[PDB]
Structure formats: C-alpha cells, structure tokens
Short mmCIF file of C-alpha atoms in Angstrom, two decimals:
data_model
loop_
_atom_site.label_atom_id
_atom_site.label_comp_id
_atom_site.label_asym_id
_atom_site.label_seq_id
_atom_site.Cartn_x
_atom_site.Cartn_y
_atom_site.Cartn_z
CA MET A 1 128.15 68.83 90.09
CA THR A 2 124.35 68.51 90.37
CA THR A 3 123.76 71.51 92.63
CA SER A 4 122.56 74.79 91.21
CA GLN A 5 124.94 77.63 90.45
CA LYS A 6 122.99 79.49 93.15
CA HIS A 7 123.89 76.82 95.71
CA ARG A 8 127.50 76.97 94.52
CA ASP A 9 127.61 80.76 94.78
CA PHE A 10 126.27 80.64 98.35
CA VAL A 11 128.58 77.94 99.66
CA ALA A 12 131.66 79.50 98.05
CA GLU A 13 131.98 82.36 100.56
CA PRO A 14 130.82 83.69 103.96
CA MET A 15 127.23 84.87 103.77
CA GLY A 16 127.50 88.18 105.65
CA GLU A 17 124.33 90.22 105.22
CA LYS A 18 123.09 88.36 102.17
CA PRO A 19 119.27 88.35 101.84
CA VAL A 20 117.26 85.22 102.38
CA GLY A 21 116.73 84.86 98.61
CA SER A 22 120.45 84.02 98.21
CA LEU A 23 119.76 80.57 99.62
CA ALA A 24 119.23 77.75 97.14
CA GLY A 25 115.58 76.78 96.99
CA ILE A 26 114.37 80.18 98.25
CA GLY A 27 112.81 81.95 95.29
CA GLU A 28 111.00 85.26 95.48
CA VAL A 29 107.70 83.77 96.69
CA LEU A 30 109.27 81.82 99.58
CA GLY A 31 111.64 84.70 100.30
CA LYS A 32 108.82 87.20 100.75
CA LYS A 33 107.00 84.83 103.12
CA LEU A 34 110.17 84.32 105.13
CA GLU A 35 110.79 88.08 105.28
CA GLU A 36 107.20 88.61 106.46
CA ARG A 37 107.94 86.19 109.32
CA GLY A 38 111.13 88.04 110.36
CA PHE A 39 113.63 85.79 108.52
CA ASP A 40 114.97 88.55 106.32
CA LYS A 41 118.65 87.65 106.02
CA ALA A 42 120.15 84.29 105.16
CA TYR A 43 121.92 84.20 108.51
CA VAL A 44 118.59 84.20 110.37
CA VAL A 45 117.66 80.99 108.51
CA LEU A 46 121.12 79.63 109.32
CA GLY A 47 120.29 80.40 112.94
CA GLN A 48 117.17 78.26 112.82
CA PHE A 49 119.11 75.50 111.05
CA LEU A 50 121.64 75.60 113.90
CA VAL A 51 119.07 75.87 116.71
CA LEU A 52 117.55 72.69 115.23
CA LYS A 53 121.00 71.06 115.49
CA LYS A 54 121.21 70.80 111.70
CA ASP A 55 118.46 68.17 111.67
CA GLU A 56 117.15 67.70 108.14
CA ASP A 57 113.64 66.61 109.08
CA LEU A 58 113.08 69.32 111.69
CA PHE A 59 114.55 72.02 109.49
CA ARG A 60 112.66 71.00 106.35
CA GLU A 61 109.40 70.74 108.27
CA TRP A 62 110.04 74.16 109.83
CA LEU A 63 110.65 75.64 106.37
CA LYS A 64 107.45 74.03 105.06
CA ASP A 65 105.40 75.38 107.97
CA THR A 66 106.96 78.84 107.79
CA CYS A 67 106.92 79.65 104.08
CA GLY A 68 105.19 76.74 102.35
CA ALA A 69 108.32 75.27 100.77
CA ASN A 70 107.89 72.05 98.80
CA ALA A 71 110.16 69.04 99.19
CA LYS A 72 112.64 70.10 96.53
CA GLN A 73 112.86 73.70 97.75
CA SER A 74 113.44 72.54 101.34
CA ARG A 75 115.98 69.91 100.30
CA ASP A 76 117.89 72.56 98.35
CA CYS A 77 117.81 75.10 101.19
CA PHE A 78 118.93 72.48 103.72
CA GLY A 79 121.73 71.22 101.47
CA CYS A 80 122.97 74.76 100.88
CA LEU A 81 123.11 75.51 104.62
CA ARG A 82 124.63 72.11 105.37
CA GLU A 83 127.45 72.63 102.89
CA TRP A 84 127.98 76.25 103.95
CA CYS A 85 128.41 75.06 107.56
CA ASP A 86 130.82 72.31 106.51
CA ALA A 87 132.90 74.96 104.77
CA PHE A 88 132.77 77.84 107.23
CA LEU A 89 131.32 76.97 110.64
CA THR B 2 139.18 93.90 127.58
CA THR B 3 138.81 90.15 127.09
CA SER B 4 139.85 86.76 128.37
CA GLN B 5 142.06 84.31 126.51
CA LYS B 6 138.99 82.04 126.35
CA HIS B 7 137.34 84.79 124.30
CA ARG B 8 140.32 85.32 122.01
CA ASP B 9 140.72 81.58 121.49
CA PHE B 10 137.05 81.28 120.50
CA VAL B 11 137.00 84.22 118.11
CA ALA B 12 140.23 83.14 116.41
CA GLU B 13 138.86 80.15 114.47
CA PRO B 14 135.73 78.35 113.25
CA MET B 15 133.91 76.80 116.17
CA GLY B 16 133.03 73.56 114.42
CA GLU B 17 131.75 71.10 117.01
CA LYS B 18 133.17 72.94 120.03
CA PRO B 19 131.16 72.31 123.21
CA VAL B 20 129.04 75.06 124.67
CA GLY B 21 131.62 75.47 127.41
CA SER B 22 134.11 76.89 124.91
CA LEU B 23 132.13 80.13 124.79
CA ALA B 24 133.47 82.96 126.91
CA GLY B 25 131.38 83.28 130.06
CA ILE B 26 129.95 79.75 129.87
CA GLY B 27 131.50 77.88 132.78
CA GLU B 28 130.78 74.45 134.14
CA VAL B 29 127.53 75.39 135.86
CA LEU B 30 126.06 77.34 132.93
CA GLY B 31 127.20 74.73 130.41
CA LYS B 32 125.39 71.97 132.29
CA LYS B 33 122.13 73.95 132.31
CA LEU B 34 122.53 74.74 128.62
CA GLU B 35 123.16 71.09 127.73
CA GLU B 36 120.12 69.99 129.75
CA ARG B 37 118.01 72.33 127.60
CA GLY B 38 119.47 71.08 124.31
CA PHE B 39 122.24 73.63 123.78
CA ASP B 40 125.11 71.16 123.91
CA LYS B 41 127.42 72.72 121.28
CA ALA B 42 128.54 76.31 120.85
CA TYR B 43 126.96 76.46 117.40
CA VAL B 44 123.49 75.90 118.88
CA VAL B 45 123.92 79.06 120.98
CA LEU B 46 125.22 80.80 117.86
CA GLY B 47 121.96 79.67 116.26
CA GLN B 48 119.90 81.42 118.94
CA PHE B 49 122.07 84.53 118.66
CA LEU B 50 121.37 84.58 114.92
CA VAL B 51 117.64 83.86 115.18
CA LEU B 52 117.50 86.87 117.48
CA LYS B 53 119.20 88.94 114.75
CA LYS B 54 122.27 89.49 116.98
CA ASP B 55 120.22 91.69 119.34
CA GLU B 56 122.35 92.21 122.44
CA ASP B 57 119.54 92.84 124.92
CA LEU B 58 117.32 89.98 123.74
CA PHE B 59 120.18 87.46 123.52
CA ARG B 60 121.58 88.27 126.98
CA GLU B 61 118.07 88.10 128.45
CA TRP B 62 117.49 84.77 126.71
CA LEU B 63 120.71 83.42 128.16
CA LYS B 64 119.81 84.59 131.67
CA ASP B 65 116.36 83.02 131.35
CA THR B 66 117.72 79.81 129.92
CA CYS B 67 120.74 79.01 132.09
CA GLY B 68 120.90 81.72 134.77
CA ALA B 69 123.83 83.70 133.37
CA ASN B 70 124.63 86.84 135.33
CA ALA B 71 125.37 90.13 133.61
CA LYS B 72 129.10 89.47 133.29
CA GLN B 73 128.64 85.95 131.94
CA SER B 74 126.05 87.08 129.37
CA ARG B 75 128.18 90.07 128.38
CA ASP B 76 131.15 87.77 127.80
CA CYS B 77 129.14 85.22 125.84
CA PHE B 78 127.44 87.84 123.66
CA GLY B 79 130.74 89.55 122.85
CA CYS B 80 132.46 86.33 121.84
CA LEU B 81 129.61 85.43 119.49
CA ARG B 82 129.45 88.95 118.06
CA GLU B 83 133.17 89.02 117.32
CA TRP B 84 133.11 85.47 115.95
CA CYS B 85 130.36 86.46 113.53
CA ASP B 86 132.27 89.56 112.43
CA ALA B 87 135.25 87.36 111.56
CA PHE B 88 133.57 84.31 110.00
CA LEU B 89 129.85 84.77 109.15
#
C-alpha cells in the first residue's frame, strides 16, 4: 500500500459529516481555503467530484483554482474520492 | 408515503444507475437532465451535495434545470435525502 493512512482511514467507511480536512491531500491550509469558499464538509467536495462526472482533470483543476492545491495534493484528494466512490457509491 | 421507485433507489448504492432511476424523474425530465449533462443519478446527487442538501435550493435548481413540478422535485429530493442518510 502506497496511499497514506489518512487516505486509508477515509476510504474505509462512509464519510458522514466528516470535515473537509479528512480528505487525503487536504491539509489545514487547503482546508481553511475550501471552508472559506463554502466547501466545509468532505461531502461537499464529493459533490463537486460527482458533478464533474469524476473527471480527474476537471476535478484537479477545480481544486487548484479553488484552494491552490499542488499536483500531489490534488492527486491525493482525487484518488481518495475515487476510491471512496468505488467502495460506497 | 413513497413509491416503490423511491424505496428501490434508497435500498442500495446507486452506482452507475441512470438519472431516470431517481424517484420523480420520468422520461421527459430524464431527457432534459441528460441533455444538460446529468446523465447518471450520481451527478444529481453531486448537485444535491454541492448545495449542502438544502431542500429549497435543490428543488428550485431541479425546476430550473429540467422543469420538474413540485411533486417531481419533492420526490427526487426525498429519495436523495434518504439515500444519503443510509449510505453517505
């Protein structure tokens, strides 16, 4: 396993009301910027992932534009949502 | 109360179900949704979630997007709300 333990913890269970910082790749800096833009719970970011039809490029660009995520942070966030959806959606 | 279409939707993960599997989304509404990019139920779930599950704003969005009447939007909201309570 090459994912983080934080990715593994997120994809292991339904997300419920978990905050946005529970997503892999979303540290405190990115999480605050997301919260300032209304994306305060992980499920709101899932919503954007789903509205973008789970498209990696669109989602990772959206994350970049919205909170300034770098390539690794956006890859990690995407992969965490992608694997959560494969498990639970 | 609820339709069997609702109960069937809320009973299981939606996976790749088409948008027409959502309660209230019939053939006419589904066509309009697909034309606008909402071809699978999970894309409408996405909009529901981006709107923070807000009933008024989601039902208004659905009316504006595909022409859903009050009953159709009520049925579609309720099926997404109950699905989220079970699986999200």
